[PDB]
């Protein structure tokens, strides 16, 4: 599913991401924009053989099981395919664990490089939330 901007903001709020670990909703929408362009079915293969999945491009080295990332963990206790669903619940619940891991949203390199320190509230501006 390719979400609209305000549609994703509302779904993220519904699932408790607004201000989670202190990160306002616009931070999460901005991260999803640059990770996946709001497409739940986005995937990306990394040089090390791991794969990133879903709207927030969550990686199989630590967070989900895809059966093809040797030595990896599955700390969100989900198949990576669950991160591709039109229902964002699994992505949101896993992102909550990731953002609590110690480095906040810096875990998403694209958030650090493209959202951090910018006017992220613009990503939710105009939306009925
Ligand atoms: Cl903001
Ligand atoms: Na894994």
From Swiss-Prot:
Belongs to the glycosyl hydrolase 22 family. GO terms for molecular function: beta-N-acetylglucosaminidase activity; identical protein binding; lysozyme activity. The keyword Disulfide bond applies. Its main location: secreted. Substrate binds at residue 101. This is Lysozyme C. The active site is at 35, 52. Keywords: Allergen, Antimicrobial, Bacteriolytic enzyme, Disulfide bond, Glycosidase, Hydrolase, Secreted, Signal. The keyword Signal applies. Lysozyme C is capable of both hydrolysis and transglycosylation; it also shows a slight esterase activity. It acts rapidly on both peptide-substituted and unsubstituted peptidoglycan, and slowly on chitin oligosaccharides. It is an enzyme of class 3 (hydrolase). GO terms for cellular component: cytoplasm; endoplasmic reticulum; extracellular space. In the egg white and polymorphonuclear leukocytes. It comes from the Eukaryota. InterPro entries: Glyco_hydro_22, Glyco_hydro_22_CS, Glyco_hydro_22_lys, Lysozyme-like_dom_sf. PANTHER family: LYSOZYME C. Disulfide bonds join 6-127, 30-115, 64-80, 76-94. Residues 1-129 form the C-type lysozyme domain. It is found in: Secreted. It catalyses: Hydrolysis of (1->4)-beta-linkages between N-acetylmuramic acid and N-acetyl-D-glucosamine residues in a peptidoglycan and between N-acetyl-D-glucosamine residues in chitodextrins. Its EC number is 3.2.1.17. Monomer. It comes from Gallus gallus (Chicken). Pfam families: Lys (PF00062). Lysozymes have primarily a bacteriolytic function; those in tissues and body fluids are associated with the monocyte-macrophage system and enhance the activity of immunoagents. Has bacteriolytic activity against M.luteus.
């Amino acid at each position: 599913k390719v979400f609209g901007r305000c549609e994703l903001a509302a779904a993220m709020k519904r699932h408790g991401l607004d201000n989670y670990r202190g990160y306002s909703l616009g931070n999460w929408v901005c991260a999803a924009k640059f990770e996946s362009n709001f497409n739940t079915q986005a995937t990306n293969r990394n040089t090390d053989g791991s794969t990133d999945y879903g709207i927030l491009q969550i990686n199989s080295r630590w967070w989900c099981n895809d059966g093809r990332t040797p030595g990896s963990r599955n700390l969100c206790n989900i198949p990576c395919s669950a991160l591709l669903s039109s229902d964002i619940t699994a992505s949101v619940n896993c992102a909550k664990k990731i953002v609590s891991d110690g480095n906040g949203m810096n875990a998403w390199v694209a958030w650090r490089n493209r959202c951090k320190g910018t006017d992220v509230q613009a990503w939710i501006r105009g939306c009925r939330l």
